[PDB]
Amino acid sequence: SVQNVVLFDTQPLTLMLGGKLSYINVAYQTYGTLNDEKNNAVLICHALTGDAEPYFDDGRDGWWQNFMGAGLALDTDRYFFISSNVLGGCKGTTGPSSINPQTGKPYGSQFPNIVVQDIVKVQKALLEHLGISHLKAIIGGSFGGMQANQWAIDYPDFMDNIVNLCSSIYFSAEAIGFNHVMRQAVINDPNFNGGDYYEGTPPDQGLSIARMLGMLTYRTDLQLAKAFGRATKSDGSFWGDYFQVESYLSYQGKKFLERFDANSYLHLLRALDMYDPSLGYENVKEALSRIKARYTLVSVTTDQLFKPIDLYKSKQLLEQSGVDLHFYEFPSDYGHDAFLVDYDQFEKRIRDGLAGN
Amino acid sequence: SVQNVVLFDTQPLTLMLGGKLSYINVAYQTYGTLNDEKNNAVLICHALTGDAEPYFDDGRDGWWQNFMGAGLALDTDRYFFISSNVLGGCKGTTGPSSINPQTGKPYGSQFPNIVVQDIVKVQKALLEHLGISHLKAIIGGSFGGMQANQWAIDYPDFMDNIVNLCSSIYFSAEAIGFNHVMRQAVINDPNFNGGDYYEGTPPDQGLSIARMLGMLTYRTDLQLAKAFGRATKSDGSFWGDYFQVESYLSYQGKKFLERFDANSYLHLLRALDMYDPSLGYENVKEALSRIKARYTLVSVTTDQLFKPIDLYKSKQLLEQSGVDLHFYEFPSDYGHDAFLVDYDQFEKRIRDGLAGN
Numbered sequence: 001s002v003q004n005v006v007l008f009d010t011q012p013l014t015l016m017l018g019g020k021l022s023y024i025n026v027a028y029q030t031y032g033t034l035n036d037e038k039n040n041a042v043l044i045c046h047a048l049t050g051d052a053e054p055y056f057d058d059g060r061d062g063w064w065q066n067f068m069g070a071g072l073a074l075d076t077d078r079y080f081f082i083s084s085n086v087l088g089g090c091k092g093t094t095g096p097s098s099i100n101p102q103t104g105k106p107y108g109s110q111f112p113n114i115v116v117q118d119i120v121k122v123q124k125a126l127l128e129h130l131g132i133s134h135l136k137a138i139i140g141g142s143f144g145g146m147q148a149n150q151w152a153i154d155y156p157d158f159m160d161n162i163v164n165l166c167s168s169i170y171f172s173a174e175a176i177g178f179n180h181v182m183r184q185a186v187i188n189d190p191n192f193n194g195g196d197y198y199e200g201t202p203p204d205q206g207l208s209i210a211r212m213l214g215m216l217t218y219r220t221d222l223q224l225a226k227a228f229g230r231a232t233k234s235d236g237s238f239w240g241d242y243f244q245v246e247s248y249l250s251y252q253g254k255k256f257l258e259r260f261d262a263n264s265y266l267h268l269l270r271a272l273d274m275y276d277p278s279l280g281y282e283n284v285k286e287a288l289s290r291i292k293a294r295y296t297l298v299s300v301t302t303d304q305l306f307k308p309i310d311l312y313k314s315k316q317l318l319e320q321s322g323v324d325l326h327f328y329e330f331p332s333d334y335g336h337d338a339f340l341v342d343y344d345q346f347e348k349r350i351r352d353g354l355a356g357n
Numbered sequence: 358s359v360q361n362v363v364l365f366d367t368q369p370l371t372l373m374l375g376g377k378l379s380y381i382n383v384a385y386q387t388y389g390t391l392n393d394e395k396n397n398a399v400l401i402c403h404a405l406t407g408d409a410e411p412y413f414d415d416g417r418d419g420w421w422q423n424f425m426g427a428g429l430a431l432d433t434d435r436y437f438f439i440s441s442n443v444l445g446g447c448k449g450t451t452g453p454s455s456i457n458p459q460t461g462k463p464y465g466s467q468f469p470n471i472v473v474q475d476i477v478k479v480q481k482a483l484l485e486h487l488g489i490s491h492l493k494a495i496i497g498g499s500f501g502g503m504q505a506n507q508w509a510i511d512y513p514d515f516m517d518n519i520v521n522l523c524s525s526i527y528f529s530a531e532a533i534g535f536n537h538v539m540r541q542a543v544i545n546d547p548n549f550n551g552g553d554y555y556e557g558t559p560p561d562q563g564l565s566i567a568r569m570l571g572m573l574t575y576r577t578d579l580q581l582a583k584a585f586g587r588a589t590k591s592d593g594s595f596w597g598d599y600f601q602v603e604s605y606l607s608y609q610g611k612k613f614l615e616r617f618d619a620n621s622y623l624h625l626l627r628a629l630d631m632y633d634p635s636l637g638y639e640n641v642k643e644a645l646s647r648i649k650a651r652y653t654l655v656s657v658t659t660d661q662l663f664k665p666i667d668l669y670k671s672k673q674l675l676e677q678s679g680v681d682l683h684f685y686e687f688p689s690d691y692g693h694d695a696f697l698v699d700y701d702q703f704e705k706r707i708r709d710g711l712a713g714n
Contacts, residue, residue, distance in 0.1 A: 245530045246534070
């Protein structure tokens with residue numbers, strides 16, 4: 001039961017890469033109870049395909065369901081959580097599928113290019129609307145960790161703690177490569193129509209293929225060996241699903257189409273791979289030297305997307321700027337998805353991160 | 358200047374998965390001089406996108422150019438090398454782009470499904486034609502290593518030495534996943550026309566995307582970080598090439614179209630991921646227990662496609678069947694491509710492998 005507010009109505013959002021957006025709807029949810037001191041507020045930043053709803057109490061499973069709730073690491077008895085769909089998203093916050101106020105048709109190909117710096121400005125405006133003037137913590141994994149990192153730079157005294165799970169401050173060359181293949185799969189779909197597909201058939205073939213590729217970067221080869229190995233589908237096909245792992249990828253690629261928009265996927269992939277914490281500052285050292293928060297950074301050693309090399313490059317850059325840094329690492333079969341799955345290994349890191357330990 | 362011979366004319370090749378092929382042209386090349394004892398013959402088996410020409414002496418660069426020649430690891434002063442394009446290929450040996458003798462049009466969608474067991478039967482027939490009744494060695498990397506492995510099983514006393522570089526006897530679940538995405542990229546190209554595209558526009562979009570994905574599995578993230586890092590293209594585009602790594606992938610994907618056929622790519626991907634040395638035998642242990650050759654297996658520890666987990670699973674299976682096994686491993690920035698690039702680390706392994714050391 002997502003909440004909504006229209007912002008940037010009387011003054012547009014000026015985007016880092018140029019051009020502007022007006023009448024930005026922000027979809028968001030809150031959980032728990034803000035205390036009298038108002039000192040227990042936590043911002044949750046979602047990952048690439050996440051949305052405003054990490055948790056439900058009524059029987060549904062949110063994207064962080066088993067990590068969140070009464071007495072759990074994301075403790076709804078303790079904190080007041082705010083979670084919002086990013087600018088450029090497709091689950092309520094203004095994105096390329098939204099109606100362009102200037103045309104009455106979806107933005108589509110006309111949606112401006114956005115970066116994490118824009119996304120966090122929208123989140124700041126939301127918190128201003130909600131009357132939250134300081135945060136106990138900001139927490140996010142993956143693309144959400146980049147949002148948390150950017151918050152730490154842009155609003156250095158606004159939060160006590162930053163909890164960055166499984167992200168680096170720069171995306172690797174190889175990871176850019178995967179994003180590139182995913183974008184090209186979408187854009188070369190015969191129904192893409194340059195991004196203006198909303199009045200016709202959507203680019204389902206390309207988006208489902210892109211999603212399958214993304215999924216192959218999110219866990220580990222060991223996890224897939226355990227789940228499927230070389231099990232075969234009973235009546236498979238050579239040019240379709242023959243192995244069980246192929247069946248699973250095809251099923252999940254198709255299921256993804258029910259919940260995501262191709263243009264949003266393109267815009268957020270580019271925000272992710274373009275992310276540069278130095279943008280708007282003299283250089284990265286100057287940007288990171290702004291950070292005053294207690295900063296927790298967690299590396300999964302088996303992550304195949306944000307690999308240890310990237311996490312260590314980030315660790316070094318943060319240390320070089322004198323960040324109050326607390327770095328932790330461990331292996332997980334779940335690789336990049338571990339921050340969403342491996343509660344046993346993340347529980348203490350999250351609990352301690354939020355609390356200032 | 359490839360040589361050609363038509364085989365399986367008076368008796369068709371019966372394929373493992375059913376159905377038959379007649380009038381199979383085999384494109385091949387020989388190098389060096391067969392000695393009077395005829396005991397210096399070596400079969401080279403090419404990898405997924407390789408062909409019959411690993412070497413040229415006239416100025417051109419073959420696919421194994423810097424490893425091969427006078428006094429080099431693949432020593433053309435010492436051995437008589439035979440190299441042939443695989444069944445299902447597109448560089449001279451009968452494949453889906455070849456004319457179907459029964460229709461006068463390319464096989465296309467009518468090309469039968471093939472496996473490594475079929476490919477090696479064609480190679481055996483070629484050697485019979487050439488009057489080679491025993492080999493000093495068989496050598497191949499990647500998909501070529503699978504061909505070498507299969508030779509060792511099917512014709513156990515036909516060769517002294519087997520040199521298997523960077524392949525396992527089974528493809529992993531994750532690796533199957535990548536093949537699946539690559540196949541779907543091709544098949545969902547608007548010009549694929551179910552595989553019968555030869556009279557129209559070829560599926561260039563899908564094939565170039567598939568190739569880009571393949572390339573991201575063939576080296577290492579470190580190698581890409583060294584080559585490109587986050588360097589940008591001077592006048593890039595958001596939905597096209599923005600980073601230098603993207604430019605490179607797009608350029609190489611396009612260049613690949615000049616030399617490869619989409620249907621061949623599909624057929625060989627399936628031969629690779631379906632490869633099962635137990636096929637036609639009671640089980641894998643029975644199959645591998647047939648091997649009598651001195652068997653060299655090399656693992657690149659940084660290989661991101663045939664990962665150490667797979668190479669060790671293979672090592673164990675070969676040992677369990679009492680194979681005369683000689684296993685070596687080392688890291689390389691070039692990962693799966695190291696057997697084609699990293700001469701410094703492969704030179705001794707190849708030299709020793711061929712010679713019976």
